[PDB]
Amino acid sequence: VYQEPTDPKFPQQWYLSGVTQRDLNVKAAWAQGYTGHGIVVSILDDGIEKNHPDLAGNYDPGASFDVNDQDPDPQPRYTQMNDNRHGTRCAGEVAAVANNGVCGVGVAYNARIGGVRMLDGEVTDAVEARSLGLNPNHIHIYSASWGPEDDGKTVDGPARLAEEAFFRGVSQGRGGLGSIFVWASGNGGREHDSCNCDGYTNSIYTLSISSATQFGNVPWYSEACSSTLATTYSSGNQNEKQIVTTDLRQKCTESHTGTSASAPLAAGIIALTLEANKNLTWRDMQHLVVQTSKPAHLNANDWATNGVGRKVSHSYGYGLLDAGAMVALAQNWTTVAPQRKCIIDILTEPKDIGKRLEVRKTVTACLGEPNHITRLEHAQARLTLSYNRRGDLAIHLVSPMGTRSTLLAARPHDYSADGFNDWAFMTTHSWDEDPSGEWVLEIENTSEANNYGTLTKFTLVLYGTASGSLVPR
Ligand SMILES: [Ca+2]
Numbered sequence: 001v002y003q004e005p006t007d008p009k010f011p012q013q014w015y016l017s018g019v020t021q022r023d024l025n026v027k028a029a030w031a032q033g034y035t036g037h038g039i040v041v042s043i044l045d046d047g048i049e050k051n052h053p054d055l056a057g058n059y060d061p062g063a064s065f066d067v068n069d070q071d072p073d074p075q076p077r078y079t080q081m082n083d084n085r086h087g088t089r090c091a092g093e094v095a096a097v098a099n100n101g102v103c104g105v106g107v108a109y110n111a112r113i114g115g116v117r118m119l120d121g122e123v124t125d126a127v128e129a130r131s132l133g134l135n136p137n138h139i140h141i142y143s144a145s146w147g148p149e150d151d152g153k154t155v156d157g158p159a160r161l162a163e164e165a166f167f168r169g170v171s172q173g174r175g176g177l178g179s180i181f182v183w184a185s186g187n188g189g190r191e192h193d194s195c196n197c198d199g200y201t202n203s204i205y206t207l208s209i210s211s212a213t214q215f216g217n218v219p220w221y222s223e224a225c226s227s228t229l230a231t232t233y234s235s236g237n238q239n240e241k242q243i244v245t246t247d248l249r250q251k252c253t254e255s256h257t258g259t260s261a262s263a264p265l266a267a268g269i270i271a272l273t274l275e276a277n278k279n280l281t282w283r284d285m286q287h288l289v290v291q292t293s294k295p296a297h298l299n300a301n302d303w304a305t306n307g308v309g310r311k312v313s314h315s316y317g318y319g320l321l322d323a324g325a326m327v328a329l330a331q332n333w334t335t336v337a338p339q340r341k342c343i344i345d346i347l348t349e350p351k352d353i354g355k356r357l358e359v360r361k362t363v364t365a366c367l368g369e370p371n372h373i374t375r376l377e378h379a380q381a382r383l384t385l386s387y388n389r390r391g392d393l394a395i396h397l398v399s400p401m402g403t404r405s406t407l408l409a410a411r412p413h414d415y416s417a418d419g420f421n422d423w424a425f426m427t428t429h430s431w432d433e434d435p436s437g438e439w440v441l442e443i444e445n446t447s448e449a450n451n452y453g454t455l456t457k458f459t460l461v462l463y464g465t466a467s468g469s470l471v472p473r
Pocket residue numbers: 066069071072073074075
């Protein structure tokens with residue numbers, strides 16, 4: 001009975017539907033009757049062309065604001081260079097109108113779509129906070145790709161107002177179920193960037209997404225890190241297709257690219273999922289992504305099986321999003337138990353790093369206490385250390401179940417002598433593992449240089465629950 005969209009560029013949207021099996025399985029969701037009706041998504045970027053012929057029908061002024069000029073109208077600023085086209089491109093990925101003879105379609109082509117104009121000006125902590133915190137009882141899902149420069153030498157994350165916006169969002173947003181913040185993991189591949197150094201994507205409050213090329217490879221621009229959860233398709237080399245969407249000046253583009261094109265596709269899939277079950281919490285949604293995402297046919301040299309039998313990669317997280325599987329699993333999903341937090345201060349004395357430092361600690365994970373965790377979600381190693389050349393460091397963390405997470409890869413351009421100041425390196429790779437037992441932190445100098453420094457604090461922070469586990473995969 002389901003008739004797929006007739007839009008002129010829909011056949012070019014290879015990632016939505018293909019006979020190849022190299023797609024996001026979105027048609028299967030549409031055929032189950034989920035197209036995003038009733039869900040509200042906001043693009044946090046450089047504005048949205050609200051009168052675009054493929055956006056106007058789904059546009060929601062209630063999901064929109066202009067923080068740069070402080071007015072309700074997120075219309076992009078037009079220039080000869082068309083610099084402010086990115087938000088419009090991303091909006092079309094989520095919610096371009098279907099069956100209207102214009103361009104292609106959004107993943108959630110019946111969802112409502114808005115945009116916050118907030119990148120076209122000075123992006124302060126306050127600007128970020130007011131964008132993240134926009135109308136949080138109306139907007140369900142936020143999509144963003146901003147954060148620290150992808151130069152492979154920066155370490156930065158949300159300051160106080162923005163971090164407060166994240167906690168207010170997931171705590172009180174969406175009727176207490178929590179705002180869904182979908183994030184792109186970064187575009188710094190060429191600079192050998194490592195995305196746990198980006199505190200926005202490295203946050204537990206953001207659902208972080210990386211890219212795969214059409215032929216199933218890790219694109220040139222990709223950043224690997226343990227905080228990433230999953231993957232959607234985006235651009236690659238010049239023989240591979242790219243993302244097809246709405247463009248500035250009421251046009252259509254077939255050349256939208258980069259990890260920033262992956263996050264909106266994920267946001268669209270999450271919109272379909274929320275339509276299938278409006279009662280899903282922000283943590284429920286991350287569980288669904290972990291359980292349903294698919295490694296198959298994604299090529300990486302670092303695929304590893306974790307303690308509960310799931311394949312995970314630092315390039316891809318748990319793999320490609322599967323919209324059909326997401327909406328199926330959502331429908332009778334049982335809400336996860338309240339989030340517990342177990343704080344373990346590991347060191348009894350500072351430790352010289354030298355050539356290599358290994359710190360082993362056996363933990364009980366708050367045994368006997370209300371924060372006892374037997375079922376991990378996110379884990380953080382919050383590290384404070386000095387070092388003379390930061391980018392020469394590589395840091396790994398091994399769970400009791402033997403899952404080795406890369407917290408930090410060598411960053412050749414990072415010459416900083418500033419070290420890390422309580423930086424909360426996060427891994428998703430031990431999700432659903434029992435965190436009781438021996439954890440191992442490894443810090444090593446990857447260079448030949450005689451480097452030096454000291455680890456002064458290592459807090460292992462465990463999040464999760466103590467109930468509801470599945471039989472391991
Ligand atoms: Ca405006």
